[PDB]
């Protein structure tokens, strides 16, 4: 489910990216 | 436009501080009524408090009924209707006890193929209905306050 | 105080002539039992019914065990089975011990899925699509509650017998108000989903969500800000079979965290209604809500206990689109509603009307969107709901509710009912239920839209009447008519004569009982029976059919 360049500091954005 | 902002509190000033009494005070309905009463700035007291002459809210029987509202062409259920009825009394001390009640209606379509999910949905509906029971009980408070004056 | 009861008799098209021979047993002050031979002529045998009521410190409980050792009809229609025995086990328990302990049991077990279509409906119904098997033990104090629960379901349909069950389940809530201006809640859950089939995925889910809210209130206004933090963790096993056929691969281990932001507001306006009714007051109540939840891809998570929810006026303001915790749709929406109420001179509510809509700024996508919408609208004012409840007098009253969806491009569901009830002995009611075929196609399973008994939808008009005669009789009737097929669905008649000591009752009911797919039509059932017992009993007569009467006031 996690994307490629996802970040754990970007929860508020779509797909944490 | 004759409209204006509401100037009177939803709960009357006489019942600003009051006692919540019930045989199941850790139940969902007691929690919902306590949350609503704290929402309108009502000060809830303990049952065995030494403070007399305050209005007391006693929550009575609560019954939830899930029946069939509609059926398909094969006779199987389609709509499940859930009805919550709640009875309570408001004791104005030295004056009278006034009975009040609340009735909440809900409906949802059954689905056996995801029946467990539907069961979770049913539980969610119950947690809404208690809130609907608590909203209706609060709005009937000024009805009791008006009836107190009519006693004279 | 223990002895035989008066026999009960019945004639049914499914059973031909039936006979009951009940025997009461007063075991103790808190326990009693009933043994009922139930002789059936078409099946030509005696079903033993054992009924047991008990009251204990744990709570109140009912148990029922019905056993038919042999069956002629089931043997004829299942000639290849080992045995034709039929049975039912029912157990209901509700209790609260020592103010903190909660015990709940609702267990139903049947030998075969055609049990309730062939036998009495004391603790089940032919309309039931499955049997529920729930155990719950909880501890609840004023700011805490934990619950260990087990849920299992016996699905009656032979189209596909594959139902998930959460055998362990642990619900934990912790509340702590007045932490400064904010109120705090935390919700925890641990669930294990296991399936009846051996080739389906099995899951362990752990869920934690803190919630912090700031309420603000005045005499006229209310604003509630809420921030919630959902975190779910899935361990999925036994997923080779699912991955062998589907393109979307279920992942072995997943975890997903979402912040949810909610703003609720409401106002109250009041005016005097002297122009129409002097002394009456009218209240206009606007309400608005903003909900934001970012999109997470749930394609690799199987849907265990997430389903679409109804969108009633009050359902417009929910923060969840699906129940459970498998599917959580991303939301960027504002919902608005207005409620108008009227109060008489005694401050009693006599009328209320509500209307609302849900505006989506972006499409609510969950990564596994397979709902078959009629058209392709994704944003805008997409959902409309409306409710009304008018109390015309002390003996009159009507309710109405309508739901419109632009994605279905149609009124999804509506209902209405008007009642004249002077008392429980004498009353009249008319109600109407509607559910469009597009909604059935969108929400229900795929095969519902193609099946003849499901694809049409729901459209029924029901009438219920009750009138005493010479205050010893009580005539009761009900009729339900499906306008799509132009066919009867359920009707009944009841006549009871109540004397000083004995009360005789005669009841008739014809109901939809099943679907004959050899010819593609419906199979009905007739039942005329008399029972004797040692008020005028209108209310239990109204509850004796598959579509029981409900008070509308
Ligand atoms: C509390 C709710 C349930 C209602 C329970 C009412 C139970 C009592 C019903 C009595 C019905 C009339 O029947 C009355 O009882 C039984 C037969 O039934 C007979 O009683 C006799 O037979 C019973 C059969 O078990 C034996 O216990 C015993 O030999 C004797 O008591 C009486 O001679 C008859 O007059
Ligand atoms: C349908 C659209 C709805 C629009 C919004 C609805 C109206 C919202 C505003 C009315 C509610 C806010 O009402 C507010 O209540 C709080 C809580 O007691 C009162 O008390 C407040 O005082 C100050 C000043 O605001 C706040 O910083 C503080 O947190 C709170 O204690 C405020 O004096 C009153 O302004
Ligand atoms: C009680 C209080 C109630 C508060 C009510 C008002 C709350 C408003 C919250 C902000 C509303 C949404 O805020 C803003 O809306 C725009 C407008 O579509 C949306 O923006 C999105 O849609 C626009 C519309 O084409 C596109 O450019 C694009 O798809 C994206 O930007 C986002 O959702 C957000 O950028
Ligand atoms: C389809 C919706 C119709 C809504 C009707 C609202 C008006 C109520 C019925 C009006 C027609 C019948 O006309 C009258 O109604 C009143 C209203 O209680 C009832 O009549 C009675 O009224 C009051 C209290 O109700 C009694 O104390 C009085 O002794 C008697 O006259 C009877 O029913 C009928 O005599
Ligand atoms: C604003 C709040 C108050 C409104 C809510 C209370 C009133 C609600 C009325 C519900 C009762 C009438 O119910 C109404 O039945 C009709 C006729 O079947 C349905 O309408 C349907 O009619 C036929 C199919 O049967 C089609 O030609 C039509 O396109 C379809 O919509 C409506 O979708 C439903 O709303
Ligand atoms: C307060 C209690 C009463 C609430 C109101 C109850 C109103 C009665 C039910 C709504 C009307 C149903 O009445 C009937 O509905 C059906 C299907 O829905 C409509 O539709 C029917 O006719 C149309 C074309 O004529 C065809 O598609 C088909 O034969 C059938 O669907 C009928 O034209 C209407 O006569
Ligand atoms: C307030 C009302 C109280 C209820 C009033 C009526 C209750 C008694 C209902 C008796 C039902 C039996 O009478 C009915 O006759 C019709 C006549 O076609 C036949 O029934 C058949 O045709 C009728 C219409 O013609 C269809 O609606 C029905 O679905 C079909 O089975 C059956 O013979 C029986 O279903
Ligand atoms: C699953 C996941 N992965 C990343 C990198 N970030 C988030 C928020 N979630």
Residue numbers in the entry:
A (entry chain C): 1 to 17
B (entry chain B): 999 to 1150
C (entry chain A): 225 to 758, 766 to 784
Tell me, in the authors' exact words, what the paper reports.
LPS biogenesis systems are essential in most Gram-negative bacteria, with LptDE responsible for the delivery of LPS to the outer leaflet of the OM. The outer-membrane associated β-barrel is made up of 26 antiparallel β-strands (β1−β26). These β-strands are connected by turns on the periplasmic side and extended loops on the extracellular face that fold over the lumen of the barrel and require rearrangement to allow LPS molecules to reach the external surface. LptE is tightly bound in the LptD β-barrel.
To confirm the SPR competition binning, four additional cryo-EM data sets using different Bicycle molecules were collected from competition bin 1, which had the most unique sequences. All five imaged molecules (Compounds 1–5) in this epitope had an aligned sequence contacting the β-barrel of SfLptD, with a ubiquitous W×(D/EE) motif making a consistent interaction. In each of these interactions, the Bicycle molecule tryptophan indicated was docked into a hydrophobic pocket formed by Pro483, Phe485, Tyr516, and Pro518 on LptD, with further stabilization coming from hydrogen bonds formed by the guanidinium group of Arg520 and the hydroxyl group of Tyr516 contacting both the amino acid backbone and the side chain functional groups of the D/EE residues. Overall, this indicated a level of motif specificity in Bicycle molecules binding to SfLptDE, despite the relatively small interaction surfaces, demonstrating this high-throughput screening process did not select for merely nonspecific detergent-binding molecules. All Bicycle molecules had a protein binding face and a detergent binding face, with protein contacts being stabilized mostly via hydrophobic interactions. Overall, the backbone of SfLptDE showed little rearrangement upon Bicycle molecule binding compared to the apo conformation.
